[PDB]
Design a protein around this ligand. Structure first.
Ligand SMILES: [Cl-]
Ligand SMILES: [Cl-]
Ligand SMILES: [Cl-]
Ligand SMILES: [Cl-]
Ligand SMILES: [Cl-]
Lengths: 30, 30, 30, 30
């Protein structure tokens, strides 16, 4: 499953991009 | 147990203040 | 001229979009 | 005169701390 996370993905995930949500920038992680 | 959340606390929680974590500001929620 | 500004454009400018710069989200103002 | 800047102070300035302004964190520079 994919999630938006700050500041980085958790171990086992890969960052595919970035999310813009609630006026902040997140890692897009799957 | 408290948490840092963006942009707001969840139901069940009261906001006590703000967190500064990973270069972002978060609601500090318990 | 166009600028990235937080949290909003200044009087006389119009927001055309958003900038991603230095891990924050800005108004794109011209 | 001090200023709030993202992501860092400019030349001529010393960072004294951090600003919390408009939901973002800034370098506090004089
Ligand atoms: Cl991998
Ligand atoms: Cl931010
Ligand atoms: Cl917040
Ligand atoms: Cl206009
Ligand atoms: Cl900073």
């Amino acid at each position: 499953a994919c999630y938006c996370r700050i500041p980085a993905c958790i171990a086992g995930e890969r960052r595919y991009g970035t999310c813009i949500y609630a006026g902040r920038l997140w890692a897009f992680c799957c």
